[PDB]
């Protein structure tokens, strides 16, 4: 601790007085991830193995809530033709707790791959569907030219070429009727320099990339404060209180001492927060319990030592903490070790603070 002052002062000669060096902190001794048992598994493989999807504007969706979803089967690595994801892959999504999940399924063309992206425009992006800028999920694409393609074109799937206005992200228009194409309203049936807005795909197994269909699956993720009953392979991880640990509770990952409190929460209220809008007390997602989040102990380190030419005696002063582990004394400033307490009063030499001073004597 004397050498900590030497590197703090950037010199080998420590002058007589009190000097601040470092900051002590209690590190977490364990990791407690507490979540109840799993209910079912998400159809992660059924959306990829489905026989046929919907069109781009008609896209079908399967809503699966209460994450974590099924992490066992993961096709994110070299399974399909095109894998473009944001954030972390579903391999790392097993540690995240999301409220609702929207699985979108639609088939696009070759030149339409660049048009599918969050916050990006395009022919089918504006006129059919656009991914929202809040999209945290993965965009999966595979080459269906050996299946969905038909001789002479596949007209089952449809796409809207023209529309009176551009669709906002996360908006659905299924209308197949005849509407205004250009700037001149043609009053229904095609004519008067307008065009039939809906169009059929030309999927041909024998043509190039532009005419090749690509099955695209979009997993839309929504994170809220709602509780999550499934996180990772480890569920219970039996609770240990009165210790500094790394906790993950209802999808909230943090480090702090876990202490039981008398705080009364309403049945719909999952967790509280303090004046700083940070996690204060959370409730057990498994059983009925209310647990308080206590920050682990920390504070500043003060070194009380005389001059280098005096002696090597060093008195370490901890700021605002009581030392229960451990010449161990306690003052209003905190734990003070390496010094002796004299009931007599002397002139202040090296101030400790709170009306107490330290000195080097016999």
């Amino acid at each position: 601790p004397l050498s900590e002052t030497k590197c703090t002062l950037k010199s080998f000669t420590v002058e007589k007085g009190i000097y601040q060096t470092s900051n002590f902190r209690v590190q977490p001794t364990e990791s407690i991830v507490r979540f109840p048992n799993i209910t079912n598994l998400c159809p992660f493989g059924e959306v990829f193995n489905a026989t046929r999807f919907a069109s781009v504007y008609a896209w079908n969706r399967k809503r699966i809530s209460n994450c974590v979803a099924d992490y066992s089967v993961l096709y994110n690595s070299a399974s399909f033709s095109t894998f473009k994801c944001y954030g972390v892959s579903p391999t790392k999504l097993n540690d995240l707790c999301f409220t609702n999940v929207y699985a979108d399924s639609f088939v696009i063309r070759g030149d339409e791959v660049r048009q599918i992206a969050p916050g990006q425009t395009g022919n089918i992006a504006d006129y059919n569907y656009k991914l929202p800028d809040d999209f945290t999920g993965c965009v999966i694409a595979w080459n269906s030219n050996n299946l969905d393609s038909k001789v002479g074109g596949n007209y089952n799937y449809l796409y809207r070429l023209f529309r009176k206005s551009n669709l906002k992200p996360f908006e659905r228009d299924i209308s197949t009727e005849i509407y205004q194409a250009g700037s001149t309203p043609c009053n229904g049936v095609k004519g008067f320099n307008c065009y039939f807005p809906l169009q059929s795909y030309g999927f041909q197994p024998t043509y190039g990339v532009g005419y090749q269909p690509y099955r695209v699956v979009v997993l839309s993720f929504e994170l809220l404060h709602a509780p999550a009953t499934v996180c990772g392979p480890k569920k219970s991880t039996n609770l240990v209180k009165n210790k500094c640990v790394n906790f993950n509770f209802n999808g909230l990952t943090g480090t702090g001492v876990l202490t039981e409190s008398n705080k009364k929460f309403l049945p719909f209220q999952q967790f509280g927060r303090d004046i700083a809008d940070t996690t204060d007390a959370v409730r057990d997602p498994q059983t009925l319990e209310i647990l308080d989040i206590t920050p682990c102990s920390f504070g500043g380190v003060s070194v009380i030592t005389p001059g280098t030419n005096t002696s090597n005696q060093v008195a370490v002063l901890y700021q605002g903490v009581n030392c229960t582990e451990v010449n161990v004394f306690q003052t209003r400033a905190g734990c003070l070790i390496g010094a002796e307490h004299v009931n007599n009063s002397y002139e202040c030499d090296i101030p400790i603070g709170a009306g107490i001073c330290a000195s080097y004597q016999t």
Binding site: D274, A276, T278, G299, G300, R332, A333, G353, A354, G355
Partner: peptide
């Protein structure tokens, strides 16, 4: 004229004064 302990949790440390109020009354 606690807010002290609440702010000490975010890393804001309130240092105790060297001169106590009882010693202030003695100088007075």
């Amino acid at each position: 004229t606690d807010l002290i302990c609440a702010q000490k949790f975010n890393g804001l440390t309130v240092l105790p004064p060297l001169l106590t109020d009882e010693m202030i009354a003695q100088y007075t």
